[PDB]
């Protein structure tokens, strides 16, 4: 009873599941979920981050008709990619997998119709 995605939305909910899919999965898995601070001992995470964003919580918003257009839904993967650069150092593995999975996102959101 949600509503059928607009055109551009039908492209934003490809690209989701393709950073959800296998195929990406080497680099894609520390932005599946929520960073869970307290299991990882990072105790200024929500510190740093106020406003956390993961892939489960973009796919979440995708499914609620959270998202307006492609513009929100893009603002949102974007911010997941910054509060990594923001909170982890610049030569971190975090970072490399951030870079390589916002390449992926970057390179298709340019191909929407
Ligand atoms: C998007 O995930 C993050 O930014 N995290 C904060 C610290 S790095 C940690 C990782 C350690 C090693 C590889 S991934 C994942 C959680």
Not at 4 to 33: D, M, R, T, V
Not at 50 to 61: A, G, I
Not at 68 to 82: N, P, T
Request: glycine letters at 2%.
């Amino acid at each position: 009873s949600m509503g059928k995605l607009s055109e551009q939305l039908k492209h934003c909910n490809g690209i989701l599941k393709e950073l959800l899919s296998k195929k990406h999965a080497a680099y894609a898995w520390p932005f599946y979920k929520p960073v869970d601070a307290s299991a990882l001992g990072l105790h200024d995470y929500h510190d740093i981050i106020k406003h956390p964003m993961d892939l489960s919580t973009v796919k979440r918003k995708m499914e609620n008709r959270d998202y307006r257009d492609a513009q929100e839904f893009a603002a949102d993967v974007r911010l997941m990619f910054s509060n990594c650069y923001k909170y982890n150092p610049p030569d971190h593995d975090v970072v490399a997998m951030a870079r390589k999975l916002q390449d992926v996102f970057e390179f298709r959101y340019a191909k929407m119709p």
